[PDB]
Amino acid sequence: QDISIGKLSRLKIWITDNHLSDDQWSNTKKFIIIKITTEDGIEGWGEAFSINFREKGIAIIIKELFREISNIPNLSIKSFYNKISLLSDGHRGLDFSSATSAIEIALWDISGKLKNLPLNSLLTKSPKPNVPIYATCWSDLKKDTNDYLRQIEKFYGKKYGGIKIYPMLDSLSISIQFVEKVREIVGDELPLMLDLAVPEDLDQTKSFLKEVSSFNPYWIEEPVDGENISLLTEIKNTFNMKVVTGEKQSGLVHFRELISRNAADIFNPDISGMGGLIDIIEISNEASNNGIFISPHCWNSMSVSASAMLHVCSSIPNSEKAEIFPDYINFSKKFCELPFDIIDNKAHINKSAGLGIVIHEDILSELSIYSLDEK
Amino acid sequence: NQDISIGKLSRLKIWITDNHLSDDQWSNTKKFIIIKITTEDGIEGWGEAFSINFREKGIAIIIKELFREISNIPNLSIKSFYNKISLLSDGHRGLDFSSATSAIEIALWDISGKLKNLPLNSLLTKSPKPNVPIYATCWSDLKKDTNDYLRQIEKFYGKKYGGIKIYPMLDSLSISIQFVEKVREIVGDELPLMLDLAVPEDLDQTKSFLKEVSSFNPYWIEEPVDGENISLLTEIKNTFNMKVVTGEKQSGLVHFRELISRNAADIFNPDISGMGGLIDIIEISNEASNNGIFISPHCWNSMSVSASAMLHVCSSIPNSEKAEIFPDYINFSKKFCELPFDIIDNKAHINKSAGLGIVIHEDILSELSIYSLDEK
Ligand SMILES: [Mg+2]
Ligand SMILES: [Mg+2]
Ligand SMILES: [Mg+2]
Numbered sequence A: 001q002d003i004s005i006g007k008l009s010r011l012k013i014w015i016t017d018n019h020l021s022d023d024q025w026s027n028t029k030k031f032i033i034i035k036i037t038t039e040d041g042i043e044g045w046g047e048a049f050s051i052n053f054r055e056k057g058i059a060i061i062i063k064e065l066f067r068e069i070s071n072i073p074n075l076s077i078k079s080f081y082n083k084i085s086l087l088s089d090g091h092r093g094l095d096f097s098s099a100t101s102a103i104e105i106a107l108w109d110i111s112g113k114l115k116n117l118p119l120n121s122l123l124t125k126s127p128k129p130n131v132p133i134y135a136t137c138w139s140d141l142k143k144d145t146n147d148y149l150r151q152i153e154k155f156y157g158k159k160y161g162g163i164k165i166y167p168m169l170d171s172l173s174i175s176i177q178f179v180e181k182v183r184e185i186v187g188d189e190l191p192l193m194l195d196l197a198v199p200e201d202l203d204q205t206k207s208f209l210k211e212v213s214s215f216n217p218y219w220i221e222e223p224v225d226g227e228n229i230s231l232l233t234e235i236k237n238t239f240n241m242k243v244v245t246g247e248k249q250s251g252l253v254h255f256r257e258l259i260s261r262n263a264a265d266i267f268n269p270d271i272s273g274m275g276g277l278i279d280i281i282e283i284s285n286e287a288s289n290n291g292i293f294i295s296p297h298c299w300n301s302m303s304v305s306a307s308a309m310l311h312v313c314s315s316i317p318n319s320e321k322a323e324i325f326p327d328y329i330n331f332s333k334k335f336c337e338l339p340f341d342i343i344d345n346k347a348h349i350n351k352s353a354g355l356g357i358v359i360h361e362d363i364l365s366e367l368s369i370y371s372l373d374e375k
Numbered sequence B: 001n002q003d004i005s006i007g008k009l010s011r012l013k014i015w016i017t018d019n020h021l022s023d024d025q026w027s028n029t030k031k032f033i034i035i036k037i038t039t040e041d042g043i044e045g046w047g048e049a050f051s052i053n054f055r056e057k058g059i060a061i062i063i064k065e066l067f068r069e070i071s072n073i074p075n076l077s078i079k080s081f082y083n084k085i086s087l088l089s090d091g092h093r094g095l096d097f098s099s100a101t102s103a104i105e106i107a108l109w110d111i112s113g114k115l116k117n118l119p120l121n122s123l124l125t126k127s128p129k130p131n132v133p134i135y136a137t138c139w140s141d142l143k144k145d146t147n148d149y150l151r152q153i154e155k156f157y158g159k160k161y162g163g164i165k166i167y168p169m170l171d172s173l174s175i176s177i178q179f180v181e182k183v184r185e186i187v188g189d190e191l192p193l194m195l196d197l198a199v200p201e202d203l204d205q206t207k208s209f210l211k212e213v214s215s216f217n218p219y220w221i222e223e224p225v226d227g228e229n230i231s232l233l234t235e236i237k238n239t240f241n242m243k244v245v246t247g248e249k250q251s252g253l254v255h256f257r258e259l260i261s262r263n264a265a266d267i268f269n270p271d272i273s274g275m276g277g278l279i280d281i282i283e284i285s286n287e288a289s290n291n292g293i294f295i296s297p298h299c300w301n302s303m304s305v306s307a308s309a310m311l312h313v314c315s316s317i318p319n320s321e322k323a324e325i326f327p328d329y330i331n332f333s334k335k336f337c338e339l340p341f342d343i344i345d346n347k348a349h350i351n352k353s354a355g356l357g358i359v360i361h362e363d364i365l366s367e368l369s370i371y372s373l374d375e376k
Helices: A055-069 A077-088 A094-115 A119-123 A145-158 A172-186 A202-215 A229-238 A252-260 A277-288 A304-315 A326-335 A361-366 B056-070 B078-089 B095-116 B120-124 B146-158 B173-187 B203-216 B230-239 B253-261 B278-290 B305-314 B327-334 B362-367
Strands: A008-016 A032-038 A043-048 A130-136 A163-165 A192-195 A219-221 A243-245 A322-324 A340-343 A346-349 A368-374 B009-017 B033-039 B044-049 B131-137 B164-166 B193-196 B220-222 B244-246 B323-325 B341-344 B347-350 B369-375
Touching (some): A008 A055, A008 A361, A032 A055, A032 A094, A043 A055, A043 A094, A055 A077, A055 A094, A055 A368, A055 B056, A055 B095, A077 A277, A094 A119, A094 B056, A094 B095, A119 A304, A130 A304, A163 A172, A172 A192, A172 A202, A202 A229, A229 A243, A229 B253, A252 B230, A277 A304, A304 A322, A304 A340, B009 B362, B044 B056, B044 B095, B044 B305, B056 B095, B078 B095, B095 B120, B146 B164, B146 B173, B164 B173, B173 B193, B173 B203, B230 B244, B230 B253, B278 B305, B305 B323, B305 B347, B323 B327
Parallel strands (some): A130 A163, A130 A322, A163 A192, A192 A219, A219 A243, B131 B164, B131 B323, B220 B244
Antiparallel strands (some): A008 A368, A032 A043, A130 A346, A340 A346, B009 B369, B033 B044, B131 B347, B341 B347
């Protein structure tokens, strides 16, 4: 992190268009992927957590930050981090944190290349070679319950380390019947994660959690808004179930308040959304000292973001299962020779330098709706 | 009144002002982000986003994208706008986005005021206060000694504002205290003197300062700790017998509801152009009121569109505290805006024009701008 990178010379940004999967399950979100090249010709890849209607705004922020840091002759990951601290002056938000994550991730990739080390080897002496994963089952398109059940059975056959579903439906009985039907497929052994996605009615959430405990969910994600610290503590303390929060927030101070208030058991900040890897690792360590696990959120491409997450999870003692969107794999494969492979419940990651990213830029450009290249 | 039908939107203009020297060369003005939306029926509304260094163009691009999405909604209103924002954001917030939606919502309020031929405060409550108590913030980004601040504080004193806010955390505890002491000597014992600690890195310095400063009777203590560290805010509020202010760097209803739940502050100061919009500022003002908490909107923005929205909001709530002005931004803002209020001693007097009462000379605003966007 104190590795001298030198001066930055070039920035390219792609924003991919939405793409319908071959099986028609879902459309990909627009991804924001960046490549930074140093004066010495070293390339690093980054990815920003993309947010609907804000992708171009995030990309513009990245370009403005790049301009500001690009003539710093002794840039390092740490000095970038410190410059951002100064510039930001305590004004925080997800869009800004996504922009800084993309740049910082690229600097980590470059630093790996400079040391001839995979990112996980930069982070710890003895990283884990295989990373437990789980699969998220979600679509942007309207589905009926049987549509989901069919997709879930497909996931079950792949032998992922777990499956995450979104069970908050039109009514309590329908929601719990969905959970029961999923259990009919996966059995009682498989980690089954439940993403409640911040239900608007707290009483509906309380009834659901009262009714679902018999199905032994592996975790309960976002039962209330992440800034509702008091209700997270209450929920966590009322039900015996592991509470996950963090995907929609960023910055150390928020997560330190979650720790102080015993508000969650697992944090899931987005790998490309927290602000960068320095803060992901720092909160991972603090969490580990307080019995909290880290399961980075990764609603991003299965290329750059996914590699960053796998490296981080392989480097920390308190990782939980890492998030995969199987329906995003084939699209990511179009332009990226992926630096990992999935065998049953684990991803085996690159031992090559940095993030191990090999992207066919011509294809990435073909798939993009917006771009930037800037010396 | 949030149901007032606005219709389809036809045009967006955005200006981002360059930095300029403020009045009497006291500071550089920050870059401002001011927007004008024109509806299909030809009604013009003005908004302003809370601008953030290196993010100004990013914020403008977000406003532009939001505008495109909402411009074809035939039966658009403040309410349907608010609901649409809630749907598309899906709990992803942050200051930049909240600044973008503030600017658009504020413009829709201006439009709504114009459609009813009523000033905004009259849309907000039946019987608004015509006058709004204010206080002046003394802050500069230019290099000065304590002496330069003192002469500026004499100037402000002369102006008979409702209060003066200073930033007293200097090189050391005793230099910080000396500064507060000298200020109190200039302004006398009666004047509200507010202290903005600006989130000191070292909690021990903060505690030592607050222990020594209490004898100077500060009116309030602003941001003694990070606004997201609710645990520490409560600890500070519980330790000292001084009013605690927080909120300027946060947005969204949920965080402020948590602060209320936790009795974590005495006054909230979300920025008028940063909270997300007026609906949310008013909603939190009402909840705060029920809990004995006052609202003093933060306004580090132009003294044109943002200041007018702030004054209209403050005039319409029963639990307003003194409203923030940057005196050095007043004549700068006067370059392009015939301001819709007059500061008379300790109170800003709102005019009776429809909506926010904005009269802006766009060619002057353009001349002062580093960036601009014009969208159909
Ligand atoms: Mg989730
Ligand atoms: Mg604990
Ligand atoms: Mg302040």
